[PDB]
Amino acid sequence: GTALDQRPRVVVGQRVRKGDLLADGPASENGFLALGQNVLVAIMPFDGY
Amino acid sequence: AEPGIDKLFGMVDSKYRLTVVVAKRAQQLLRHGFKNTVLEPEERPKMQTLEGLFDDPNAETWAMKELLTGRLVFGENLVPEDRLQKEMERIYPGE
Amino acid sequence: FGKRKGEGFGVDKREVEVLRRAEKLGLVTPGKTPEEQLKELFLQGKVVLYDGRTGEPIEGPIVVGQMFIMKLYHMVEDKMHARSTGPYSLITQQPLG
Amino acid sequence: QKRKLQVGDKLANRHGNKGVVAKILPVEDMPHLPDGTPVDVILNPLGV
Amino acid sequence: YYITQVRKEKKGAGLEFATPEEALAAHERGEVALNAPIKVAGRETSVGRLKYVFANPDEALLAVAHGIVDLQDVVTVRYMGKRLETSPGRILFARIVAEAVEDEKVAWELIQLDVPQEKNSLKDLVYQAFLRLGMEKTARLLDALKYYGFTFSTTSG
Amino acid sequence: DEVWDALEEVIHGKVVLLNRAPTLHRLGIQAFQPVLVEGQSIQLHPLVCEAF
Amino acid sequence: SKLKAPVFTVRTQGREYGEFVLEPLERGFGVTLGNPLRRILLSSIPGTAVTSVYIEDVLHEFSTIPGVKEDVVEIILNLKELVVRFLNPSLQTVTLLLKAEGPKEVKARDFLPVADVEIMNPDLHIATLEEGGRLNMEVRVDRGVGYVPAEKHGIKDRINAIPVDAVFSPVRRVAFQVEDTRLGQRTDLDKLTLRIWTDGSVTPLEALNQAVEILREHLTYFSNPQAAAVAA
Amino acid sequence: LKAPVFTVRTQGREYGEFVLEPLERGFGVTLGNPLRRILLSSIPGTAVTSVYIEDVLHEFSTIPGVKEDVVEIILNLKELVVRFLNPSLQTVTLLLKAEGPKEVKARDFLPVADVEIMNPDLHIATLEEGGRLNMEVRVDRGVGYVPAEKHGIKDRINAIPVDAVFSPVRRVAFQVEDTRLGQRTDLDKLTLRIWTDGSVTPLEALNQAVEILREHLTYFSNPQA
Structure with missing residues (x-):
């Protein structure tokens, strides 16, 4: 089911290096494995929730 | 839990008896009208936007309530099963 | 914190009141300036936290930070059904949809 | 479908x-640092 | 559990009150000085028991609400005709229970507030409550416990 | 909205039965008074996370 | 949202306890009102209580008394339970007198009458006297708010006198919940119910109204600008 | 009897420190928390409600000449912060239309009478050559958080409703510091700090909040049953 689009990460008239990335995969963030997020967690109990 | 349940297990020899009594009471409570009841006068079940559980939401709760009084009678073979239904339909209209 | 002081702001009476319980609990080392105590408490992973709904502080410091956490294939679409009535299989008369 | x-x-x-x-709490009443920055998620310590 | 708990600290000096009356007032000068903390072995009492003494419980936790005393601290308090060396926490627990079930006097009887609360103590409580008081009251008791448990849980941090 | 109010009216004091997967003793199923809630999952009283 | 103008409903029995319910309220407003209303109720409500006591022949707070069953402390305790009420602002305080002898049960009504001071609390048990049971005492009652320990206020009457913990606040307890109520399609709606325990000085409702008044009042304080800005 | 010094500081349209002192012990929280919680929610404002793009028929499209997928764009759009200068205005349709090699910013919208884009350097989207972008966004005034799911707004049937985050409050922090003033030490000096997108100013919002609260105290007017 999951959507796998590629997004482009480069601009018109930008030089580039061999092996540099051009577009990000399904779950990639600037060419790093991006499977979820970084959220701000507090780690305490809550009123039974 | 539900209103005064310990008092109702106290009322019978078998836990399950209570269930049968309540069930059958709510049954006739519905079948032969709803004015079957022994308690309406003043302060009986009620609900909340008008107020009327004084007509017909939940029947078995009515049963438990009546039963909580010593008003009803429960017993193994009180009355011949046929003349029972005869008498019920004859005394109360509401079809 | 360094910013906090220059911006115009020292300690919250709440911050103090939780540092009380902090040293009584053995997390900060008594005799020290709240600044240095808060540094201590920070390094151990924990910081003061206020309840959202009361604004009173939480009577004990609390670890917080950035955590990587993900959303799994198990959303609640594939998951919630509720049948009243409908179709029934032809040989066996137990239902389907 | 976009699945929030x-x-x-x-x-x-x-x-x-x-x-x-x-439980989805409104920003307003969930644990926030001294500076008005709130946390995003709240994990039970009992899980550890 | 967090609420039904007591501290101890630094009786660095053998603060013996058990005998001396020079140990009531002066050991408290020492307390208000830099010396003897509010809950420490003064054998027969901890200074905290000398210092604060409550008539109501209602009062006790007025005091506690004003940040004079914590729930895990050790005070003297007057419940049901007895001057009790107890934590406000413990007395509150006692109240929670006593409230859930109308009959305060039993509620007192069947709880052990001379110690903290671990799952076993609670288990035994719920059993006993069932036994002596009955089903749906135990129901209400149970929800009550669950409530305060959760609430104190979160704020305790 | 009034439809909803009627549903509420229907529910009154009826109960529904709740079961959890591997039903090993009878407390694997218990009945509860239903309560309309925002969202899309069933909500359970923590005390009987023991039984199920 | 507006027509949803909430229904302030009340169950008030006597002057000591009251349940006040107010629904329906927007998401999480129950706490927004209930929490700061309670903070007011418990501190900043205006009342009276015993602040210091002088006993004839008693010097220390612990000392037991001959002719008296109860120890000093339990008596001062009974004073901490005492509720009087002044009848006009001008009585900043009142030093109240009670002397009685021989085997009697000493009640608060035994306190010799003063013009403007009512004792809402006549039957309160103060102390029990024995044969040879002389007692004599001056108990100072002051105006104030909240709870103030013997230490923080330290009141000087006679050099033999002993300060008392000050139970000013007529409120005995406040407690409250915000539970969900529904309104049609919408279940998440906030229903505020709270409960107020008073020493009888003032009815729960009065307490409340004073407290909300205090809040509104404080809100009027945001109206006298001054200028600054900060950075380094 | 105190009569608190209300000192007001202000930095542009975004940040404002509001100091009230000296206050009855523990009133820092009693005031500086219901007001926080109100400021965060029931404060009203403006946000993009729905978008429509020439050749796009749904949010999952991509336009030719345009790096950003139409989702990237509606997300870049939610960032739009727009002052109405006249509180009769419940809504405004902004029009963008640009071509060629350009980095479309929020300033690139056509000016509309009584509206102020606060966010001019906002990076709408990135056209290369023969890139064509043309659209009508609909900003609305409203209150709190309202997904596209709930409100379902379309002027035309190639629109895409967008999630509305109205509250122009970014963060709210109270602060409660000991002020020894004159006689007693345990007084509170409460100074709460407000961060705003500029649509309203901190001050404006603080006052709207106090009003909401007072008005809410007015609901304890007449008892009943």
Whole structure:
């Protein structure tokens, strides 16, 4: 089911290096494995929730 | 839990008896009208936007309530099963 | 914190009141300036936290930070059904949809 | 369909903290640092 | 559990009150000085028991609400005709229970507030409550416990 | 909205039965008074996370 | 949202306890009102209580008394339970007198009458006297708010006198919940119910109204600008 | 009897520190928390409600000449912060239309009478050559958080409703510091700090909040049953 689009990460008239990335995969963030997020967690109990 | 349940297990020899009594009471409570009841006068079940559980939401709760009084009678073979239904339909209209 | 002081702001009476319980609990080392105590408490992973709904502080410091956490294939679409009535299989008369 | 994080969903960290989203608090009444910055998520310590 | 708990600290000096009356007032000068903390072995009492003494419980936790005393601290308090060396926490627990079930006097009887609360103590409580008081009251008791448990849980941090 | 109010009216004091997967003793199923809630999952009283 | 103008409903029995319910309220407003209303109720409500006591022949707070069953402390305790009420602002305080002898049960009504001071609390048990049971005492009652320990206020009457913990606040307890109520399609709606325990000085409702008044009042304070800005 | 010094500081349209002192012990929280919680929610404002793009028929499209997928764009759009200068205005349709090699910013919208884009350097989207972008966004005034799911707004049937985050409050922090003033030490000096997108100013919002609260105290007017 999951959507796998590629997004482009480069601009018109930008030089580039061999092996540099051009577009990000399904779950990639600037060419790093991006499977979820970084959220701000507090780690305490809550009123039974 | 539900209103005064310990008092109702106290009322019978078998836990399950209570269930049968309540069930059958709510049954006739519905079948032969709803004015079957022994308690309406003043302060009986009620609900909340008008107020009327004084007509017909939940029947078995009515049963438990009546039963909580010593008003009803429960017993193994009180009355011949046929003349029972005869008498019920004859005394109360509401079809 | 360094910013906090220059911006115009020292300690919250709440911050103090939780540092009380902090040293009584053995997390900060008594005799020290709240600044240095808060540094201590920070390094151990924990910081003061206020309840959202009361604004009173939480009577004990609390670890917080950035955590990587993900959303799994198990959303609640594939998951919630509720049948009243409908179709029934032809040989066996137990239902389907 | 765009599937936002409804209650009943599943979230888990890399270290194997299976959990369900069970309550969505409004920003207003959930634990915030001294400076008005609130936290985003609230994990039970009892899970550790 | 967090609420039904007591501290101890630094009786660095053998603060013996058990005998001396020079140990009531002066050991408290020492307390209000830099010396003897509010809950420490003064054998027969901890200074905290000398210092604060409550008539109501209602009062006790007025005091506690004003940040004079914590729930895990050790005070003297007057419940049901007895001057009790107790934590406000413990007395509150006692109240929670006593409230859930109308009959305060039993509620007192069947709880052990001379110690903290671990799952076993609670288990035994719920059993006993069932036994002596009955089903749906135990129901209400149970929800009550669950409530305060959760609430104190979160704020305790 | 009024439809909803009627549903509420229907529910009154009826109960529904709740079961959890591997039903090993009878407390694997218990009945509860239903309560309309926002969202899309069933909500359970923590005390009987023991039984199920 | 507006027509949803909430229903302030009340169950008030006597002057000591009251349940006040107010629904329906927007998301999480129950706490927004209930929490700061309670903070007011418990501190900043205006009342009276015993602040210091002088006993004839008693010097220390612990000393037991011959002719008297109860120890000093339990008596001062009974004073901490005492509720009087002044009848006009001008009585900043009142030093109240009670002397009685021989085997009697000493009640608060035994306190010799003063013009403007009512004792809402006549039957309160103060102390029990024995044969040879002389007692004599001056108990100072002051105006104030909240709870103030013997230490923080330290009141000087006679050099033999002993300060008392000050139970000013007529409120005995406040407690409250915000539970969900529904309104049609919408279940998440906030229903505020709270409960107020008073020493009888003032009815729960009065307490409340004073407290909300205090809040509104404080809100009027945001109206006298001054200028600054900060950075380094 | 105190009569608190209300000192007001202000930095542009975004940040404002509001100091009230000296206050009755523990009133820092009693005031500086319901007001926080109100400021965060029931404060009203403006946000993009729905978008429509020439050749796009749904949010999952991509336009030719345009790096950003139409989702990237509606997300870049939610960032739009727009002052109405006249509180009769419940809504405004902004029009963008640009071509060629350009980095479309929020300033690139056509000016509309009584509206102020606060966010001019906002990076709408990135056209290369023969890139064509043309659209009508609909900003609305409203209150709190309202998904596209709930409100379902379309002027035309190639629109895409967008999630509305109205509250122009970014963060709210109270602060409660000991002020020894004159006689007693345990007084509170409460100074709460407000961060705003500029649509309203901190001050404006603080006052709207106090009003909401007072008005809410007015609901304890007449008892009943």
